[PDB]
Amino acid sequence: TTTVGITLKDAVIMATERRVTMENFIMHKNGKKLFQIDTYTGMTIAGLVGDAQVLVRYMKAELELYRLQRRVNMPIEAVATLLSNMLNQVKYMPYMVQLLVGGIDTAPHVFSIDAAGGSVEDIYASTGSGSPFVYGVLESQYSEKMTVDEGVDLVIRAISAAKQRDSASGGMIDVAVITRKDGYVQLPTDQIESRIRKLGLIL
Amino acid sequence: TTTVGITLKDAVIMATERRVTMENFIMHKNGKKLFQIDTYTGMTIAGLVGDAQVLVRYMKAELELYRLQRRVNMPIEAVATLLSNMLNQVKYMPYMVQLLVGGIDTAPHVFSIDAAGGSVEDIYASTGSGSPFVYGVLESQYSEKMTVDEGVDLVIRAISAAKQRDSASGGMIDVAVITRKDGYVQLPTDQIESRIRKLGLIL
Amino acid sequence: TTTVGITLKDAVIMATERRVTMENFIMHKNGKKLFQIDTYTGMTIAGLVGDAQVLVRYMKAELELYRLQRRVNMPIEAVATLLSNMLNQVKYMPYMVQLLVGGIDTAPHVFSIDAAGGSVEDIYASTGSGSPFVYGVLESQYSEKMTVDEGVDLVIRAISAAKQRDSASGGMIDVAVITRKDGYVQLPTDQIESRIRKLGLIL
Amino acid sequence: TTTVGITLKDAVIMATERRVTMENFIMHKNGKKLFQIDTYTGMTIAGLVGDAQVLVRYMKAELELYRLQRRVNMPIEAVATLLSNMLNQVKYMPYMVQLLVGGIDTAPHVFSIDAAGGSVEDIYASTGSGSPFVYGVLESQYSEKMTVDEGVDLVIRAISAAKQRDSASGGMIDVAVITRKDGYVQLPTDQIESRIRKLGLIL
């Protein structure tokens, strides 16, 4: 699998592929690895499917309980800290998962958490089997003076490179830009196909 | 990774690098391994990221609870003793971490604690993957009659040598001098770049 | 590491080296392995550093609680029995430590306790990595008709031989003679350097 | 190590050597393996030192509590049964010890108990590293029509043969004859040296 998360000026963009295997044997050509975890932050998936979905369910539950108790959204440092403490209360029966949570509260963030609960701030991050490819292209092309359209084009070029050069990733890309103004918006697949055909990465 | 902690006349200087890997695959070129643990002592990180951050959270919590109960700062022997007892109550499900806590109470100290909770006093210490390099240069150049500027220059030369001769360490150095007079002050990165360009270790 | 404990006429002499490694990589050229455990007995350290320091803390606590409950000092047989029962209540998650406790109550003793809690009385004992050297020189030169100065000279010759012929031991020797008259007195390092320069073991 | 226990007409004789190792490295040339467990029975030691001394402490305690509750001494079958049940309540975290308890209540006995708690009556028994030598000489020279002096001479010849032909045993022999008339009497070392010089086993 692969993930990507890119922080720019006043937004943060995350995207995954949708191919679940679960065997060698690619079994599901349309899964779901990008989740809305709250109204201003989301969470991606790059690990064992069952453990990752249980962590998504628990974090949806805990953040909704949080916002319903305090009427304020959770800070991104707080959600990564909570996720790190949860993953590190059990590490000798651990969750084989590589999580990545990003979102905006007063400034956009994207955080990475490994299977032992190591939280660390960075402006662009990625996890999964097809991770070094998207790190390569993000290192080569990424600038922090981009717009939202330039950011999502960079994301689509990244995940397209990972699909062309990796076996585990593949299938249709789904992308969701989360910003302070419009809130959590997941792009429809028709606009994503339009961006792919505009960039000329289709075959 | 690498750490360094140097005790001089009336201050103690600690610094780390900022590069987190978490894989082989250096993943985060700007992490955080130097933490303010209290208003007159700090703690560095040279182990597994999740376990080390959980230990930082717990020790921040316990020292703040301490100062809030007694209105006195914790002695450095007390914080190393507490950390040793915590790490040695669980050693068969242990924390794979090499901690180093330094600070000043009535006299400056820097203490080292391994994964089994062995506390030991020393005037200069270091932990991490790039540790023997900085021990070499500290053994060759260190004197206890230095000033604060000479101390932080020695620290920057040390961590620069560890960056030039090690793979795991790297990225921008951050340094914080903790003294009795000004309290915990972390140097801004512009002054650190000025010291690097003055010493001529830039390329 | 190395220890030594020698019983003579009306006193008992213990000494260790001060070099802590904690790696291969000798890391601390000035540690602390000789501890005052009570006002008329002391305890030496020749094991894993964390476990040994936790045992020193617990035995300081228990003997102080003892003397504060009963207003009598603890017998040496009692402190070795207590330490043996503590080490043998847990031996399948054991403390990898080789302890040695000596002192005087109505007659001087020095006792040895291994990692499984085997207490045994003897007039001269030693533990640690550099142990057979000091057993050799104690077997060759030791007599029970010595004075305190002859005893501490024999101790310094022993630990100097162990330093010259072992890697794990080293650093400055510290010695404490415990007797009934003056109580627990640890010799200052200047007198120890004077005895080394008088015996001519310096280089 | 080695033990020996010999039942004759109206007495039972036990003896051990005194050399404790605890390493390969014979460390203590004067230990203690023969214990008075009650006023009419004793217990010998041929196992791991810590576990064996803890078993000696527990059995001293339990037999003293027994006699203090009932004002009668414990039968030898009862003490071996108690020791067997104690050793067999824990055999998967077992005591690596080979015990041997002998004494006289209305008729002399000497019993042997292995590490799994197998009690068995026999008129002469032995345990330890140097055990088959003393079984050989006891099988060749032992008769049940001996006196106490002939018995203790046979014991000294046995343990002297085990010292001359084994590495683990050695040091000065101590012997205690326990009989109904005089109770528990441990022979002084001067009489033992007189018997050695009379038998001509000295070198």
Next chain:
Amino acid sequence: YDRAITVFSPDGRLFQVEYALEAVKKGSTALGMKFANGVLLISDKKVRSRLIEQNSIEKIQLIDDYVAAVTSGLVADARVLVDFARISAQQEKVTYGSLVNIENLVKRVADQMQQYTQYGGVRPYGVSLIFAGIDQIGPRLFDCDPAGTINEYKATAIGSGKDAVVSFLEREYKENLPEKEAVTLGIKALKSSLEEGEELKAPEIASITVGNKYRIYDQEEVKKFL
């Protein structure tokens, strides 16, 4: 017949909860109010004899460097409850990394008091607290009931001088106010209530402005306001 245990009345009142109230009416009076960019607490300090250490007797007890507390009623229940509030705040700082809302803290403390209201075989806490501090939302000021009732105030009081102070504060309080005039108003409130000993004292006063930490005043500064 008239029910002295934590069970109900035939009109529907908890008698022991009343009786832990009117215990808190016997306590030392205390007060808090919000000002322009923060919140202040002011605690009366009736130094009765001249033997007691004048400095180290504190009623304004910090829970964190961004949440403070002052109490009234049974002082032992006060100290135990403040210790539970401290360890609860530090557990929130462990788990969620930062103290986002002080309301979670006061709700956990109030539910801890509710648990001893609820079950049998334990008396309630005879203690009443107000919490103050800033968070992500802003300057907050709570109250805490022996029943467990919390109320967020702009300006409140607690202790023996409840009614006269809250009458002064319904008469004369203004919403946004600089710190010096606000603490002058608070000293005037405490003097309005405590005119039965015909002298006020030198009380202890503490404040916080958002972005900063607690500045508990020394003995010398509070005498200049007086």
Next chain:
Amino acid sequence: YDRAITVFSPDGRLFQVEYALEAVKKGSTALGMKFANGVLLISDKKVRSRLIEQNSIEKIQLIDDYVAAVTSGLVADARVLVDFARISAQQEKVTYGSLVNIENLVKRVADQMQQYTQYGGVRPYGVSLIFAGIDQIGPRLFDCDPAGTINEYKATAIGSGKDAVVSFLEREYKENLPEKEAVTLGIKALKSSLEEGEELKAPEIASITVGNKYRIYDQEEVKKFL
């Protein structure tokens, strides 16, 4: 001698349960009704003094973004019970993945109240709640008794203004009704009961239409209905 503990009467009545029900007759009145494509809750808000923070005092407390709750009676038991309802709803969202029926939630909350009705050594909850929200079935509106009794209503009330409201709602309520006219009918209900203070107030009102989430009204919109 007339049985003040959770045991039975010689006619067969639970006296502590009763006495907790007359505790909740002393509470603040509240109301709910179903309208054409949803359900609304309307809570009276008797702002007694002018010191209490007018905004953040809330009785309409959300359990989820699709189930809401408003309460009456002992406010501490209310807050603890609403917290238990929140964690029970979130445990259902963990386990079954979605909140399919609000009836499971109200039945678990009512059984939680039953457990303290049942055993000895603990008083019952002196608190009465109504739940509202939509699910797979549709817009639902429950009640909750200190005994644990639940009843699904088209339109109900709770609190001190029970009888006058339920008389108005047996007289004048209609089944399917647009939201503006339904909330006008609700304000008329609350004014019909609360004509003893000769002024109603500005209350707090909330609604949901199926497919949407909760739209708690601000201060400015509710004054336009009034």
Next chain:
Amino acid sequence: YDRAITVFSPDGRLFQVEYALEAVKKGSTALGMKFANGVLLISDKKVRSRLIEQNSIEKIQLIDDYVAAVTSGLVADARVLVDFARISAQQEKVTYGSLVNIENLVKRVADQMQQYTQYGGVRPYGVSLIFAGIDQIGPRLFDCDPAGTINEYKATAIGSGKDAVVSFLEREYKENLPEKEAVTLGIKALKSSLEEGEELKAPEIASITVGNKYRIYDQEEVKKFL
């Protein structure tokens, strides 16, 4: 009918806490005060009969070589509480390595007394203690209440001779004072209170100066002050 169990009063007083006080008024009197570089404790020793071992009867009981304690009230509760204080001090010496502040020790002991004040089915401790010793802060001198109330004093007393001593010490105590004159003042205090047996006794007196350990005086030195 007037509430003899750890529950509240209709004015809000804990009756068993009172009754454990006025138990502690029957105890043996004791006293402590701070002097120039330390703190002293002075304990009256009413040797009633001539059979009791005059030496080994001790009321000044050490907790550590830097914290001491002397007690009044029920002597069995005293001994159990001093044993808990000893094991708590030694657990702090294990965990934090040094005894940095004596205040943590007295607060844990006082919370231990609070736990038996709080729950039902156990009586409070009928015992009152004062703690003395030096730390990182300096010479400290606490008190301990059967309620759990602690107060740091410059100079205090405990036992049957409470009021006369504290009157003498509001009249005649000075802050910084050499040790010989301070213990002369303490013997004068104890003689001022105990003028009902028309003889004082030879009491037991102990002190500490910062940097040193406890010097409990023998029988021969205390008779020279007398």
Next chain:
Amino acid sequence: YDRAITVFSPDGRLFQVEYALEAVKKGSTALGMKFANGVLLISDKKVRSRLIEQNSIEKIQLIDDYVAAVTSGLVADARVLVDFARISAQQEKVTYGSLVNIENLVKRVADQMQQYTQYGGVRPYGVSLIFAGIDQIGPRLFDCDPAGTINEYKATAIGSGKDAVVSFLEREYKENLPEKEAVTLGIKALKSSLEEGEELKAPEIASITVGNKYRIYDQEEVKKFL
């Protein structure tokens, strides 16, 4: 109504502790004293009927071969407490290898009695003991109260003949004394108290001299002192 459970009185007295005292006043009398190099216990033995086995009735019950005990009061509580003292002494012989001080043993036994004084739902022990024996310190002689109070004596008594014996022992006791004259003084003490049955009996007497073990006398030797 005058407080019959282990709770406090309004003057501050534990009435069940009193009532376990004055139970121990009904017991059989016993005595101990220190002599020149040891300590002796002397126990009266009122053989009432001629059926009871004259030999095996013992009220000199050894805890160890270096600590002995004699009791008074409820004999079942006596036997249970002596069994607990035996297993506690043997646990100390396990853990610390030798019995260094008898004071740890009597303090653990007294705290065991305190635990049943303290909690509710259990009566105290109606039993009073004195312990005797030598240690590293020397010959010791304790007492044990149903409250848990211990006192180290030179010479003491217990049982029904308390007051007359302790009057004889304040009148006529000397500190350092040979064993024959000391036990003659003890028999004279027991005869001084027990002059109401106009015959003493043949009692049972035991002693220890430091370095030796217990020599409980037979029937024939004690009649020669008589």
Next chain:
Amino acid sequence: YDRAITVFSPDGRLFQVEYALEAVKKGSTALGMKFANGVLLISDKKVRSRLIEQNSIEKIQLIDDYVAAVTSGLVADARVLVDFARISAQQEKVTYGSLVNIENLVKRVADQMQQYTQYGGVRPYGVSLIFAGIDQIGPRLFDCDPAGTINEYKATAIGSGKDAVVSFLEREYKENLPEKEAVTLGIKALKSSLEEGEELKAPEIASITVGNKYRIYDQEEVKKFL
């Protein structure tokens, strides 16, 4: 007001222990005595109706083939206690391999009765037992009190016929006696007490001689002694 629960009296008596005694005075009488090389038990058997199975009604209940027991008082407590004595004897036969002393068995059974004397919320055992048998020491004969008091007798009784039997046995008992004459003396004892029904019965009698096991007599042999 006169204390019916296991707590103390103001003179120091356990009233429930009395009331469990005087319950045991209503039981069936039984008796035991020592003879030349053993011990015998003799149990009266009041066969009331002619419907009860004459053979299998047993009061002499074996604990082991070397310890026997016979009881009086509440028969259900008797059966439960004899079952506990059996499993305790068999646990001793597991652990120590042989039954060396019967005194350990009777002391564990008596401490089991003490545990229900001691704690609250359970009534004591209303049952009284005597144990008999041989061991390493010799023929033994104990008694067991509802208080837990044990006494070793040469010859004793239990049940309703206590006083008349113990008067006969202070008058006419001899120490060493052959078995036939001893059991004739026992039948004469039982006839001396039970002369109120003017007929004795055919009782059940059992014995043991050291080295042998229990010989409970049949119906035919006991009629030849009668």
